[PDB]
PDB file of C-alpha atoms in Angstrom:
ATOM      1  CA  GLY A   1     -88.865  47.607  -7.285  1.00  0.00           C
ATOM      2  CA  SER A   2     -90.195  48.868  -4.012  1.00  0.00           C
ATOM      3  CA  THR A   3     -91.193  47.276  -0.739  1.00  0.00           C
ATOM      4  CA  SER A   4     -92.558  49.116   2.253  1.00  0.00           C
ATOM      5  CA  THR A   5     -94.031  47.936   5.517  1.00  0.00           C
ATOM      6  CA  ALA A   6     -95.503  49.436   8.618  1.00  0.00           C
TER       7      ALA A   6
END
């Protein structure tokens, strides 16, 4: 799993 925001 991965989650990234910007």
